[PDB]
Structure 1
């Protein structure tokens, strides 16, 4: 057979029109107000002047003081999966970030960037790197401990313990850290990307019994958007067991109702197609393809 998205992909490649297709998505994308993000008191809570959560979908912190964090709830109604997309936390918003994880009952955090990229700090060091050096976030009364980590060639999975120091309740948070995805770039292959995505899936972190997974890169729109678009499209395909009922551009436009700028280049859009098309093999019952991805990704 041949999926409709596969036929579309070939036509676009052939005519060399990924830029045009992508720019049309940008032109059609939703425009909603971000008035809270732009308040003077929130200036230092934003990593990028021009990347803001819409008011209607922003995550509110549960604190009468200042409830603002640069984070958006991407609620995919048809797919029945939610994601929280957020910027890489700043030195002064790491407490807020873990506060959000707590209040939203997230089980998993997906990090698609490195702390330093291109000679610059794209994300604060918001988790402990050594077991014996735990982090206390005094402003939000949270304690964070590294429990263990499994380092692979291009991604790292960490077990963290998050403790609400007010109630002494503790939770296991899983950290899935993709370390080789360049900003404004694409993963090395669909295989490496899907191997990682399926690692996130297998952990149970995307279960509806949990809060939304937290997904971030530096701005929380480029690589983050790519990750979520692929996952949602595979999920939609999965629910219906029908790949040809999935309209990737339409899904992306729906996601952009909840946060601006999701997917930052034409090639990331192109890569999203590649990931979904390849991932469809597993969804539709080629169970052995997951091992192929593992081998091809060279995680060892």
Structure 2
């Protein structure tokens, strides 16, 4: 669960909640009111509340006095498990008890103000057996609207003295507690119909041709913020093991110690110099053309990077960062100078030719294994150089033109392995490019008359690598990129 996340509270409201309803070690996370885009970790320690800043410009969640994380749920899981790791004056702050939110806003099934006719319309067009939703009455009360078979049933939810009930039995502290209770224990109608709450009603799948319509509606005060926070709440489902990236020998192979690859999707390296030679902070991304999502090379991982590219038969690399951003190294130069030949362990690379375009540089690389001439293949490195240091480009035209070229290159190469995509941590810009590429590929094959579901695509990608698509800004950029691609069709 992710109930410690309160989406609509102020700092003073946060302070009051921890002072009146919490104890020492009680905490909550919330979006920052003083700096929208940021987050605040509010912790009760010695009868007092501390407000700690969490930053995200698009690469990772950066906790002040803490570490860099892929998701807020990964951050909370780590600190609830590892005490002594979080400091203010250098004093330790412990996350012991999550203070739960009762707010139903970011639940997939909450529709707020919605008619009984409209709820019936939606459950008929998009609903299947067991599809449900929770909307407001119609006053101060709520309505649960289920589909079965086929019919639609309306169950009235009473709100009596800040608790919720279906007209008898238990009284719940939140609509979420009620929904979970009747999801587990389904209500039986007198004539024996089981009102099974199987899955929430889909509210995000749109027909591609109607992108402009939904973008216009999501731009209204914002709807994009609401849609994104509903996706963020689903991240609690994605805390898969990242045990390999934790091994003593693998520690220094990570750019960010706590941003790790899922064990089930990580790229396992097989070249193996005959002890622990099978690790790279990289994951295979499969839609539903594959990708490898990875971090910017470290001086000690360059050789491993080339072993991965060789093993996977990848012929295209998408670099989405400058080597150095804001005076900080984001990726080491893992390729030779133009016309030069370098050996990276057992792997040999020649930089045949570089071509400078407006937003990017193309490098034609020749990769082979040392002592085996019949292993040579061309690797095309597309280096996007103009992405802003913070946030996203103000227009998607540059990214789209670039992705078009990457796609046509990859498509011209017979039996080419997955496309390699990296930035610094390999989750934000990497996640964004991969998702846009996946969505635009659906529109390539099936045309403007196709269903696209942006947060479902992101969720699918996030189960293969942690925190793929970091910010609400990148989320809005994925919509704008797809809108512009459809407009030029």
Pair in the same fold by TM > 0.5: yes
Mapped partners of 1:47, 1:180: distance in 2 = 22
Residue number among 319, 322, 330 corresponding to 1:122 in the alignment:
330
Aligned to 1:97: 305
Displacement of 1:4 in angstroms is: 3.5
Displacement of 1:154 in angstroms is: 2.0
Distance 1:18 1:2, change over 3 A: closer
Displacement of 1:52 in angstroms is: 1.0
Aligned to 1:197: 403
Distance 1:216 1:135, change over 3 A: same
Displacement of 1:131 in angstroms is: 1.4
Mapped partners of 1:264, 1:45: distance in 2 = 22
Aligned to 1:163: 368
**Correspondence 1:74 to 2:281:** no
- Match of 1:211, SS state, is coil
In structure 1, stretches of 5+ residues that fail to align are 287-300
Aligned to 1:294: none
Aligned to 1:7: 213
Distance 1:111 1:205, change over 3 A: farther
Aligned to 1:295: none
Displacement of 1:25 in angstroms is: 1.7
Mapped partners of 1:22, 1:49: distance in 2 = 27
**Correspondence 1:16 to 2:225:** no
Tell me if structure 2 keeps the 8 A contact 1:128–1:144: yes
- Match of 1:109, SS state, is strand
Displacement of 1:187 in angstroms is: 2.6
- Match of 2:249, SS state, is helix
Distance 1:207 1:230, change over 3 A: farther
Mapped partners of 2:313, 2:464: distance in 1 = 20
Higher relative contact order (CA 8 A, sep 6+): 1
Aligned to 1:131: 339
Q: Deviations over 1:169-212 (max 9, x none)?
A: 21111000000113442134111111111111121358672100
Tell me if structure 2 keeps the 8 A contact 1:108–1:174: yes
- What RMSD in Å do the two structures reach over aligned CA positions? 1.9
Displacement of 1:26 in angstroms is: 2.2
Tell me if structure 1 keeps the 8 A contact 2:208–2:451: no
Structure with more helix by fraction: 1
**Correspondence 1:221 to 2:427:** yes
Displacement of 1:2 in angstroms is: 8.0
Q: Deviations over 1:112-158 (max 9, x none)?
A: 001000110011111112313x22112xx011111001112220011
Q: Aligned residue pairs: how many? A: 277
Deviates more, 1:31-40 or 1:182-191: 182-191
Residue number among 453, 458, 473 corresponding to 1:267 in the alignment:
473
**Correspondence 1:112 to 2:323:** no
Residue number among 121, 141, 153 corresponding to 2:358 in the alignment:
153
- TM-score (normalised: structure 2): 0.54
Residue number among 269, 272, 276 corresponding to 1:61 in the alignment:
269
- Match of 1:227, SS state, is helix
Tell me if structure 2 keeps the 8 A contact 1:18–1:267: no
Mapped partners of 2:411, 2:296: distance in 1 = 19
Mapped partners of 2:292, 2:300: distance in 1 = 20
- Match of 1:260, SS state, is coil
- Match of 1:22, SS state, is helix
Displacement of 1:19 in angstroms is: 3.0
Q: Deviations over 1:49-104 (max 9, x none)?
A: 22111000000111343201000000113xxx211000001000001001100000
Distance 1:74 1:217, change over 3 A: same
- Structure 1 runs (4+) deviating above 4 angstroms are 205-208
Mapped partners of 2:429, 2:411: distance in 1 = 19
Pick the structure with greater CA Rg: 2
Aligned to 2:141: none
Structure with more strand by fraction: 2
Mapped partners of 1:50, 1:205: distance in 2 = 35
